[PDB]
């Protein structure tokens, strides 16, 4: 037993990380088959990114201006197009240790693993959630652009996030692997602020189920609630409502632990209206909400990917 913030095995993605250098700017690229994906601000200098000209700076760059480098080997760029905020650099050699992969645009609440890279080398891996304001509580330094967030599905690596920038508040914004930002954010060093965002209710409930599996069950009560009377309370507390779907996603955890979904909702309701009474659940003094129902299943059932 024991329940930790657990990330996917990164081996399949690590083989795809390459260094992309344009001028003096050096940041990471994702090498899948014969195409390299990277933030489009690899072409920017220090001077022109308070408000950058992305299609003039792209004109003056040719294929040879781009160093794509996989470890000890250089990759020949044979073509470059710009789709939204990502560059697609076509290289002459298909990555040999490209995995089964697909591109997904996630919805707020879904959790992915971030392979934090610098200078084309993977540095660290950790789990993040897609907050409803389309930001991520991440940990990136300058040079982390190009790092990708991913999930592992049916031996198929779902690429869902590429890191681009840090908002002034400390949170981070990025794009999907097709170049469209998540949220209203734009790749520029201007005043941008994260919007109001909600505590992912279905993920708190999945976390509560994982605590009961691990033996934390002091918050269980005699009481049940209705779905919508629970929704009431969740409304006022920046918890966003529980749909019938959310009840259906939580079903498997419910069937495993034998506790009805509305029984947790009663326990969660006066976790909100009372506070945790100084006690901790799974080692946290907060209500942690970065665990999707699959995240709990895969960590508690011992699901492996290989």
């Amino acid at each position: 037993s024991g329940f930790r913030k657990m990330a996917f095995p990164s081996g399949k993605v690590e083989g795809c990380m390459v260094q992309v250098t344009c001028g003096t700017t050096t940041l990471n690229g994702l090498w899948l088959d014969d195409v390299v994906y990277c933030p489009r601000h690899v072409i920017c200098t220090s001077e022109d990114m308070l408000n950058p000209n992305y299609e003039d700076l792209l004109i003056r760059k040719s294929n040879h201006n781009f160093l794509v480098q996989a470890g000890n080997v250089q990759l020949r760029v044979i073509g470059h197009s710009m789709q939204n905020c990502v560059l697609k650099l076509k290289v002459d050699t298909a990555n040999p240790k490209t995995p089964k992969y697909k591109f997904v645009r996630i919805q707020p609440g879904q959790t992915f693993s971030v392979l934090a890279c610098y200078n084309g080398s993977p540095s660290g891996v950790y789990q993040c959630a897609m907050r409803p304001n389309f930001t991520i509580k991440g940990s990136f330094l300058n040079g982390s652009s190009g790092s990708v967030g991913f999930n592992i599905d049916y031996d198929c690596v779902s690429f869902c996030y590429m890191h681009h920038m840090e908002l002034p508040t400390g949170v981070h914004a990025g794009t999907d692997l097709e170049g469209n930002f998540y949220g209203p954010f734009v790749d520029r060093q201007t005043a941008q602020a994260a919007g109001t965002d909600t505590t992912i209710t279905v993920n708190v409930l999945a976390w509560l189920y994982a605590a009961v599996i691990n033996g934390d069950r002091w918050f269980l009560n005699r009481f049940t609630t209705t779905l919508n009377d629970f929704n009431l309370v969740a409304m006022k507390y920046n918890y966003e409502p529980l749909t019938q779907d959310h009840v259906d996603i939580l079903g498997p955890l419910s069937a495993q632990t034998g506790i009805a979904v509305l029984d947790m909702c009663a326990s969660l309701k006066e976790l909100l209206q009372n506070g945790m009474n100084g006690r901790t659940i799974l080692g946290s003094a907060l209500l942690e909400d970065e665990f999707t129902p699959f995240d709990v299943v895969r960590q508690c059932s011992g699901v492996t990917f290989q």
Binding site: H41, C44, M49, N142, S144, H164, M165, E166, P168, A191
Partner: peptide, 5 residues
């Protein structure tokens, strides 16, 4: 002032 990383 966002930071491009």
């Amino acid at each position: 002032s966002a930071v491009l990383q």
